[PDB]
Amino acid sequence: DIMVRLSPEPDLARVVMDDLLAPSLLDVGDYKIVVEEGLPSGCPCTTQLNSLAHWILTLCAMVEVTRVDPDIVMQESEFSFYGDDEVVSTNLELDMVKYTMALRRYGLLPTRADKEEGPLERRQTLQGISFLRRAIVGDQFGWYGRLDRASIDRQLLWTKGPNHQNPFETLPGSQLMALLGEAAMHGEKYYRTVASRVSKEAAQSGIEMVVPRHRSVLRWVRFG
Amino acid sequence: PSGTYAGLPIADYGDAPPLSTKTMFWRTSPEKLPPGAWEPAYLGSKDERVDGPSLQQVMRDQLKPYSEPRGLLPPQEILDAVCDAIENRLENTLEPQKPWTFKKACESLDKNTSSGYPYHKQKSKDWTGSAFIGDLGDQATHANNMYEMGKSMRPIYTAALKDELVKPDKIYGKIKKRLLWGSDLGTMIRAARAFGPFCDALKETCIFNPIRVGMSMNEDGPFIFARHANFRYHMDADYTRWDSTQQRAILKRAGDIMVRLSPEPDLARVVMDDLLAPSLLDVGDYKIVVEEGLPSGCPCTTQLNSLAHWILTLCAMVEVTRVDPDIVMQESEFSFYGDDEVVSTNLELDMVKYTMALRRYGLLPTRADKEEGPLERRQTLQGISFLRRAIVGDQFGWYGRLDRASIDRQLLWTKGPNHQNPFETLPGHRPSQLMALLGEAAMHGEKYYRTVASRVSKEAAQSGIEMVVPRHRSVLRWVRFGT
Amino acid sequence: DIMVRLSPEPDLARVVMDDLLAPSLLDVGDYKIVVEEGLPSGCPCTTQLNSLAHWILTLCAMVEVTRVDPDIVMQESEFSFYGDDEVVSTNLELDMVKYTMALRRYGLLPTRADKEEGPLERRQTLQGISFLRRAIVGDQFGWYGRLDRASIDRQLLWTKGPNHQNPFETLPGHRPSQLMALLGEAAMHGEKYYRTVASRVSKEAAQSGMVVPRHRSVLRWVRFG
Numbered sequence: 061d062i063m064v065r066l067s068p069e070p071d072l073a074r075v076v077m078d079d080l081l082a083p084s085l086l087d088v089g090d091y092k093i094v095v096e097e098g099l100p101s102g103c104p105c106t107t108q109l110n111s112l113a114h115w116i117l118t119l120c121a122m123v124e125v126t127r128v129d130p131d132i133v134m135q136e137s138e139f140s141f142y143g144d145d146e147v148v149s150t151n152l153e154l155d156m157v158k159y160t161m162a163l164r165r166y167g168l169l170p171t172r173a174d175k176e177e178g179p180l181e182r183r184q185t186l187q188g189i190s191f192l193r194r195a196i197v198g199d200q201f202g203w204y205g206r207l208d209r210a211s212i213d214r215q216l217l218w219t220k221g222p223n224h225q226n227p228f229e230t231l232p233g234s235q236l237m238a239l240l241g242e243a244a245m246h247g248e249k250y251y252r253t254v255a256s257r258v259s260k261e262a263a264q265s266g267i268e269m270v271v272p273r274h275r276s277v278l279r280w281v282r283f284g
Numbered sequence: 285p286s287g288t289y290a291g292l293p294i295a296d297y298g299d300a301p302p303l304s305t306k307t308m309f310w311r312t313s314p315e316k317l318p319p320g321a322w323e324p325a326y327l328g329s330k331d332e333r334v335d336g337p338s339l340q341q342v343m344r345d346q347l348k349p350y351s352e353p354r355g356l357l358p359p360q361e362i363l364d365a366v367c368d369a370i371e372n373r374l375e376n377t378l379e380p381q382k383p384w385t386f387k388k389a390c391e392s393l394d395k396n397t398s399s400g401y402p403y404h405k406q407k408s409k410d411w412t413g414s415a416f417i418g419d420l421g422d423q424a425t426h427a428n429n430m431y432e433m434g435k436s437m438r439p440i441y442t443a444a445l446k447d448e449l450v451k452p453d454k455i456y457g458k459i460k461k462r463l464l465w466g467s468d469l470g471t472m473i474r475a476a477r478a479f480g481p482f483c484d485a486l487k488e489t490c491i492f493n494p495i496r497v498g499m500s501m502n503e504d505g506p507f508i509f510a511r512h513a514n515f516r517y518h519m520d521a522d523y524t525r526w527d528s529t530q531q532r533a534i535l536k537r538a539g540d541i542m543v544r545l546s547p548e549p550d551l552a553r554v555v556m557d558d559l560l561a562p563s564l565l566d567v568g569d570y571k572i573v574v575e576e577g578l579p580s581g582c583p584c585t586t587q588l589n590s591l592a593h594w595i596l597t598l599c600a601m602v603e604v605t606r607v608d609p610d611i612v613m614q615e616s617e618f619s620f621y622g623d624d625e626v627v628s629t630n631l632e633l634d635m636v637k638y639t640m641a642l643r644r645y646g647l648l649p650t651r652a653d654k655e656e657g658p659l660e661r662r663q664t665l666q667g668i669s670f671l672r673r674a675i676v677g678d679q680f681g682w683y684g685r686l687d688r689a690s691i692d693r694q695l696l697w698t699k700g701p702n703h704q705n706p707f708e709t710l711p712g713h714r715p716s717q718l719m720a721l722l723g724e725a726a727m728h729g730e731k732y733y734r735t736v737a738s739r740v741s742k743e744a745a746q747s748g749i750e751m752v753v754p755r756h757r758s759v760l761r762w763v764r765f766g767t
Numbered sequence: 768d769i770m771v772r773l774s775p776e777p778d779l780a781r782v783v784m785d786d787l788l789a790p791s792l793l794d795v796g797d798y799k800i801v802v803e804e805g806l807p808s809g810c811p812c813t814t815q816l817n818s819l820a821h822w823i824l825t826l827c828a829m830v831e832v833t834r835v836d837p838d839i840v841m842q843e844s845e846f847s848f849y850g851d852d853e854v855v856s857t858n859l860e861l862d863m864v865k866y867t868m869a870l871r872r873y874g875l876l877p878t879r880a881d882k883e884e885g886p887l888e889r890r891q892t893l894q895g896i897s898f899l900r901r902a903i904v905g906d907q908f909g910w911y912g913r914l915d916r917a918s919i920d921r922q923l924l925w926t927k928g929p930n931h932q933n934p935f936e937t938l939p940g941h942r943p944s945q946l947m948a949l950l951g952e953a954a955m956h957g958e959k960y961y962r963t964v965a966s967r968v969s970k971e972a973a974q975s976g977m978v979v980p981r982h983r984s985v986l987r988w989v990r991f992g
Contacts, residue, residue, distance in 0.1 A: 174644060185606045185607075187606045187607070187608075188359075188606045208360065208361055209360070209361070209364045246364075246368070249371065250364075250368065373907070375983075376908075376983065376987065377908065377991060379991075379992070489991055511909060613907050679838075679841060
């Protein structure tokens with residue numbers, strides 16, 4: 061309804077949204093079944109819609125805990141929503157017990173990092189939080205998001221290509237420089253490791269590639 | 285052979301010898317023990333002090349914790365960052381070393397301990413003063429050739445029980461005897477050649493790095509404690525079952541650090557992979573498979589354990605404070621000797637969440653009052669314990685002082701050959717240990733020094749020769765300030 | 768008196784100290800004059816003696832200011848004395864006004880770093896204070912004393928040799944250990960200054976007839992080694 065009211069052609073978007081949010085027909089191959097609830101995550105705009113829903117739910121929980129009007133929360137808070145992914149920063153003293161209780165009451169499934177039962181954790185610093193598979197870090201140059209180490213090693217182990225049946229087939233056929241950049245934000249040690257791996261790899265395939273110094277590629281990815 | 289021994293899988297049959305029923309501790313005088321005094325641990329079915337279980341049952345009781353579910357692993361980003369920080373600090377601190385020869389690795393071993401599998405022979409029985417010969421010589425040569433070839437060998441550990449003075453409740457009440465891991469000569473030599481350079485280079489910087497393995501309390505102690513006292517808050521977690529509760533992944537990170545700093549990294553990688561693989565412990569009846577815990581048999585096991593302790597502590601502090609590990613490391617001073625720690629820091633640490641993260645990692649920290657709850661944090665270094673010493677400070681500086689009870693114990697008990705009745709009086713020599721005891725007693729004042737001096741004079745005037753009991757001030761100056 | 772009473776032959780040392788502290792005969796070339804006061808800084812022990820005097824004076828001022836006993840001062844404080852050079856660390860709440868007043872009353876001439884009149888400055892951190900012409904610095908590895916930059920550049924500009932008249936004459940002689948020690952002292956200032964000093968040393972070695980290590984190796988050698 062928000063998206064329609066904010067659209068330049070509200071009646072046509074109203075019809076399209078009513079069609080989108082009606083009980084959906086999912087084709088599982090054998091039959092077409094009717095899914096009445098959940099999110100139909102197929103449409104191109106589904107990410108914005110999902111993010112707006114996340115925003116609504118979060119604000120609702122905070123108004124249920126603080127009992128103050130949503131504008132008060134929203135002027136005292138900064139939200140970041142990408143579908144199911146969130147980062148919530150706020151100045152209000154939030155009772156995390158009741159916050160988690162209200163979240164679980166809505167049907168949601170919030171989880172602690174230790175995967176144990178109990179209330180959600182709130183920290184006094186943004187460092188360490190994860191967003192878009194990256195960790196939020198800060199230094200004398202400012203804040204940044206750095207891809208975790210597992211994803212870098214993983215993309216060093218696997219490359220994308222045409223569809224095949226045995227995942228352990230080696231492909232006899234860019235991304236390496238992006239991996240080098242993402243590894244530069246982890247220090248000179250990990251950069252040296254990744255640089256050795258890429259140098260050994262690219263000398264077994266295609267063409268040679270310059271392996272920059274840590275400081276140069278770090279400068280390029282941080283301050284472009 | 286299949287089955288389950290003490291909750292742990294069975295792999296093969298046991299070639300280990302029977303558990304020792306003797307003790308090395310002798311009484312110094314035929315007088316009656318004071319009530320509540322300490323006595324050597326339970327000695328088996330032949331122990332005439334109590335009727336207790338078999339030593340096999342006590343070893344089973346000590347092996348039960350190794351079957352227990354592990355704790356949670358720290359967050360991966362924190363772990364990677366802290367391991368990189370530790371490795372970088374060691375690179376900045378450690379002096380590069382030259383690879384160890386077979387001769388140097390063979391001369392580094394203690395020849396008064398068992399060779400382990402398969403001979404269980406005292407190393408000195410096949411020692412020439414230069415290299416190994418005989419059975420132990422062939423074992424050593426095979427281990428060395430496999431080391432040079434970069435080929436893997438699986439270590440076979442031998443289980444034993446520790447002979448030591450324990451509180452009487454551990455003898456006349458619920459009987460307990462600490463579990464010891466002995467290693468085989470081949471694995472000893474492999475680990476020596478691999479990590480001798482690293483351990484020695486770490487020992488040369490026992491003052492500037494928290495791994496305090498190899499330090500001398502009387503010479504290097506005061507500096508360590510002044511460095512600690514430069515900081516605001518001080519704590520000691522005093523973990524219970526440190527080795528049983530360790531996770532092999534943390535030990536693998538520590539071993540990666542130890543290998544990356546070694547002069548022969550490819551060979552040390554193979555040796556560490558062999559050390560940290562599922563361990564084969566020989567409990568006498570069977571050879572069982574211990575998949576987790578710490579195999580505390582190898583010569584480098586102390587450095588490895590200390591590094592793991594460092595990793596875990598830093599991880600917990602970074603998980604609570606969310607500040608970078610190097611920032612912690614310049615705002616903190618650690619002292620680690622295996623399971624023993626002293627942590628000094630300026631950061632305002634939420635001891636509740638700190639203890640929560642520690643218990644989440646599988647560790648078992650205990651309060652001083654032995655009651656459950658959060659860890660204690662103090663604003664002074666005074667009272668903290670490290671290497672069985674108490675940290676004290678005065679106008680001359682800081683120092684480590686042996687407790688009074690330990691002094692009384694060493695006055696009551698002396699080490700000698702293995703016997704069956706701990707209350708037998710030793711007719712033999714301790715002319716050197718006694719002077720050290722006099723020095724340790726001097727740090728308690730002239731009264732306690734007079735008492736200890738009376739006891740020493742009485743003990744040496746009823747036996748052998750004698751010695752001149754120096755003035756309090758002279759021996760105090762001698763033990764405090766190097767002479 | 769302290770130094771004599773602690774010597775193994777106190778009666779023999781007494782006469783020598785009485786001779787040392789008596790009105791001194793200073794030879795200024797034309798005459799031998801009588802210096803009744805001051806410190807005769809010629810004897811081998813003159814530094815220790817001076818330092819002991821420094822100790823006394825410092826302690827006196829503090830007990831005159833704090834009104835607490837000197838042994839309590841000394842167990843609640845840490846002193847460092849090298850003749851006229853000192854570093855005083857203490858936990859006592861010290862009125863720097865009365866401290867400087869008592870020092871100037873004793874004939875001493877304490878000076879601020881900014882060369883302005885007023886009481887002495889006390890800081891809550893040991894970092895930055897100077898002792899033996901070196902600065903006290905601390906890092907994640909511990910504390911250390913590092914020679915200032917000006918002295919390093921000066922020793923790069925000036926070298927010791929035989930006595931001559933024109934200070935701007937260039938010495939034609941071809942210094943190993945001196946330059947290596949200078950490289951070490953420059954290493955404790957960071958890789959930037961170490962690179963500059965290393966370039967200067969190499970350039971000064973291309974006019975004569977060593978291995979210039981990486982910063983980290985020499986840094987570890989001079990810090991821990």
